């Protein structure tokens, strides 16, 4: 990288101890329905700040070959991906792809129910501000599987999607919206995605009384094909790096409230 700007871009794409917030690439196949496009638009609107959008048709079938997906991940530095497609067998499909080191870590299909889908514009409410992260509620007994399955995978993927940016502090005025994902264990269980705006009322106590109002979109999914990670790749992915600001604990050595280093004798 001769150019300083290209050097900055390379350093941004370099692996780090404290990683950047993940970027999501939104793209569609050669055949994609308008319902699937509207679903993709709603998800992009919820995740605008850390997303990139493709606009062409891509002749990609992810469960056959994902070389093009890896190429797009490497080129755009996107580690989350939402891929839309349609078929006779699968009329409205959203394929969530999560990458690790520009290679496919895992994949999951979501089949969208067309008759119960409502977009964000179908609810006449105030909407979430751009860049604001919502809170998350995961409800039901389908997420407590002792063995890893499609529903635990979907919980992990949706947390990664709606995660936003990590922060040690938050304003109390930034707690006005919640994404609720409901799914129960069992013919196929339905995973329901809802978004609600939050109102607070006086209750005569210190704690306020919460009320909810529907924000959109209204989403119903059936979980389909699932590509699970290689165990070694998963181990490398769930390895946790330690920040230099996390000190290594030494035996009989501590720091007092004045910052003096204090030793213990016995």
């Amino acid at each position: 990288p001769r150019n300083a700007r290209s050097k900055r871009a390379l350093e941004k794409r370099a692996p780090k101890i404290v990683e950047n917030p993940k970027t999501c690439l939104f793209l569609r196949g050669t055949t994609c329905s308008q319902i699937t496009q509207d679903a993709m638009n709603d998800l992009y609107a919820m995740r605008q700040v850390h997303a990139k959008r493709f606009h062409k048709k891509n002749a990609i079938h992810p469960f056959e070959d994902a070389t093009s997906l890896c190429f797009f991940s490497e080129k755009n530095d996107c580690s989350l991906m939402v891929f839309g497609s349609s078929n006779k067998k699968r009329p409205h499909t959203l394929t969530f792809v999560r990458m690790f080191d520009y290679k496919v870590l895992d994949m999951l299909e979501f089949y969208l129910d067309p008759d119960t889908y409502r977009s964000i514009s179908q609810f006449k409410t105030s909407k979430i501000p751009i860049g604001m992260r919502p809170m998350m509620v995961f409800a039901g007994t389908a997420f407590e599987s002792p063995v890893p399955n499609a529903f635990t995978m979907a919980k992990s993927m949706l947390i990664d999607f709606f995660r936003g940016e990590p922060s040690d502090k938050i304003d109390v005025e930034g707690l006005r919206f919640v994404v609720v994902v409901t799914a129960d264990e069992p013919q196929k269980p339905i995973l329901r995605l809802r978004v609600y705006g939050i109102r607070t009322k006086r209750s005569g106590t210190r704690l306020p009384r919460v009320e909810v109002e529907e924000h959109g979109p209204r989403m119903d999914f059936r979980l389909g094909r699932m590509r699970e990670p290689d165990p070694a790749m998963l181990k490398e992915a769930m390895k946790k790096a330690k920040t230099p600001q996390e000190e290594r604990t030494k035996k009989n050595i501590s720091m007092d409230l004045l910052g003096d280093k204090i030793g213990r004798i016995h």
């Binding site: 609107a45 919820m46 605008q48 700040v49 964000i120 514009s121 105030s126 909407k127 979430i128 501000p129 751009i130 860049g131 604001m132 992260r133 936003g164 940016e165 990590p166 922060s167 502090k169 938050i170 304003d171 109390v172 005025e173 930034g174 707690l175 109102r199 607070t200 009322k201 006086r202 210190r206 704690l207 306020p208």
Partner: protein, 286 residues
């Protein structure tokens, strides 16, 4: 060879609609709304300042996913309620409109049952925080003495915390890095206009009459402008929501719907379009 061919039309990528209309700088908008020093998930406000030929438009705006929201708006044609009837686009009117917007924002917030989480979790050592907003000038040039900073000065004096420096106010001296508050006071109270009125009345009486025909007709002398604008500032601070009715024709919303539908031209139906196509085919055959 033809540059504009079928391949060119198929390969063409359109810009954003407001970029095509030349109204929005999306490069600046992205940094105005999606960039933050802190990540406390807090809402952000911008003071949008726009100028037309005859009016000044000031808005307090949040940015939501399906479109922007307006928290408050003040227009310079509303200054007729406070006594300013001339020069509704000048620097003094810009200051007064910014002051009006600031007072309306504070009166709407009550800084002049449902309750917020801030009041729910307020501590013992908690003080009132000022309303904060950032300036959005759009495509206007940000040079020294521009009226956008007059709107900004009016709003900041009205009580909105707007982060700013002073090197673009009228009277700023660039070599000495100092601001002439006498020139700033003159521009706030419209003394540049009054000095122009005196200068034109001394030099070119005909051009004076043509340029200030409405001032003379309404008997607004140059020496009374400072008092007029000061009294307008006092009235704005006293009653920020004074109602002003214009001389335009007044109907109800349904009456305006009917009046506009009387002049709307309806889109042709498929049957009429096919009839016209058949008539054209018959005319071509004949």
């Amino acid at each position: 060879k033809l540059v504009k061919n079928s391949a060119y039309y198929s390969r063409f990528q359109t810009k954003f609609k407001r970029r095509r209309q030349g109204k929005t700088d999306y490069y600046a908008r992205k940094r105005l709304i999606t960039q933050a020093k802190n990540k406390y998930n807090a809402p952000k406000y911008r003071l949008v300042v726009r100028f037309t030929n005859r009016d000044i438009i000031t808005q307090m705006v949040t940015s939501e996913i399906n479109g922007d929201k307006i928290f408050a708006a003040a227009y310079s044609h509303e200054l007729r309620a406070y006594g300013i009837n001339h020069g509704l686009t000048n620097w003094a009117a810009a200051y007064a409109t910014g002051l009006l917007l600031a007072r309306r924002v504070l009166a709407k917030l009550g800084l002049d049952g449902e309750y917020t989480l801030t009041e729910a979790a307020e501590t013992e050592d908690g003080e009132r925080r000022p309303f904060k907003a950032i300036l959005d000038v759009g495509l206007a040039r940000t040079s020294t003495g521009a009226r956008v900073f007059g709107v900004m000065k009016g709003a900041s004096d009205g009580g909105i915390f707007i982060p700013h420096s002073e090197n673009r106010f009228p009277g700023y001296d660039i070599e000495t890095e100092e601001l002439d508050t006498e020139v700033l006071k003159k521009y706030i109270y419209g003394g540049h206009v009054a000095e122009y009125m005196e200068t034109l009345a001394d030099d070119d009486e005909e051009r004076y009459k043509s340029q200030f025909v409405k001032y003379i007709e309404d008997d607004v002398e140059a020496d009374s402008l400072e008092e007029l604008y000061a009294e307008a500032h006092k009235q704005i601070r006293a009653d920020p929501f004074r109602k002003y009715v214009s001389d335009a024709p007044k109907k109800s919303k349904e009456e305006w719907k009917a009046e506009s539908l009387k002049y709307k031209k309806a889109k042709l139906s498929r049957e009429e379009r096919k009839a016209r196509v058949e008539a054209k085919i018959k005319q071509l055959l004949a």
